[PDB]
């Protein structure tokens, strides 16, 4: 019935839609293709910043980054990179943050390890920007699931994965995100608070992961993922699909 | 007529609009506040990439970025930074390229010097990302003019500021830009080619610089710049102002 409404959205937007909202005390979980794999695209940048915060003292956020270009001091701090990675979905920033995690594969293994540390046994990051938005449909590389990513985001924002000060930094960056106004945010009434991280890619990929707070003060975690493989590489992402999906979710949580 | 239409746009969008289109064989120049200063915002990224290309052999584009704390190789080269800076308007990429061009603290001077070398005596870059989008209205720092930036872009894409292979790289990156669909592109009919670089910032700043080709093969250079200083730091940029301005321009060039 809710399932029937999501199926109608898929029909209307010629798309595959995935939704997960964890249960609360007064609401059942919402799950639609929740264990199907979808490309992360830029949604990984929210947990990425969490990983960097967790692995380092707060002072590290003041570290001005340096690099070498022989197959150099910059004016950029890790904190500035965290801000850019979330609020502007800056890919180069994410690549530098991944490298800051250390380990093999530019930090992709370390990031995947951080997710494992949060009990996410499903998600994987294999490549970095820009390739991670460009895997063909069906490729498991660089994917998560609505279910997986929702439970990660829940621990980060609502749980204890980060101490309070670090948690506040992540929450604020997500709260001031500039890219999500036409996705989950558009589907929830204005008196709900929404913090989010978007993701977009080829094959009509459009994602948004959010923590929303009802007027009554109840937090919910909403993960919506979509793609349009029927259109091939050039399929247009449909933000309005995510907004409409968010509206269905809101109607159930109201 | 045209000046009156731009004035009306300013009134309707509560904004300051600047326009410059160089003359061609069959068309008069278009100029509206063309010599007034506006913040570059990310528009500087196109000339930035030209500067790096000019000062280096094409082999430089293959140089890898290694993040250093004391070494973590990224999957990123100078070429990929060029692609990111222009197509995704990556600020972090721009900052790395500024460092590549002038060294630590020297990129902005090197960039300004490059513009001087192209005969642009007006523009200046003083800060890096993100500060360069944040100067108070009336600060001359980090500004160009529609007139200045149009003539720079003309030399880069249509002139011989760059040798053919380098020129082709810059043109292609601009051609595949993902961020400008609602600005100049939105004002020109679909059978016109549009390559562009956008810029957005605080105080309602929204810019776009483009080279457009008519179906008959005639190139025009279009620079549109806007801000909403009266609304203060948080004023919303209005993309539709740029699209409308572009539509007026297109109607005159058709």
Author numbering:
A (entry chain A): 29 to 83, 86 to 101, 113 to 145, 145A, 145B, 145C, 145D, 146 to 238, ...
B (entry chain D): 29 to 83, 86 to 100, 112 to 145, 145A, 145B, 145C, 145D, 146 to 238, ...
Authors' description from the paper:
We investigated the roles of three conserved prolines at positions 107, 226, and 258 in the β‐lactamase BlaC from Mycobacterium tuberculosis and found that mutations can lead to dimerization of the enzyme and an overall less stable protein that is prone to aggregate over time. BlaC has 15 proline residues but only these three are 97%–99% conserved among class A β‐lactamases (Armon et al., 2001; Ashkenazy et al., 2010; Berezin et al., 2004). In this study, we investigated the effects of substitutions on the structure, activity, and stability of BlaC. It was found that substitutions in all three prolines lead to an overall less stable enzyme, more prone to oligomerization and aggregation. We propose that one of the roles of conserved prolines in BlaC is to prevent protein association and maintain the monomeric state.
Pro107 is found at the edge of a small loop, which carries the so‐called gatekeeper residue Ile105, important for substrate specificity (Feiler et al., 2013). The crystal structure of BlaC P107T was solved at 1.9 Å with an asymmetric unit comprising four molecules forming two sets of dimers. The region around the mutation (residues 94–117), including α‐helices 4 and 5, are restructured. Eleven residues (101–111), could not be solved due to disorder. Interestingly, the crystals were formed in 50:50 ratio of phosphate buffer with pH 6.4 and malonic acid buffer with the same pH, proving that the formation of dimers is not only occurring at pH >7.5, as was observed in solution.
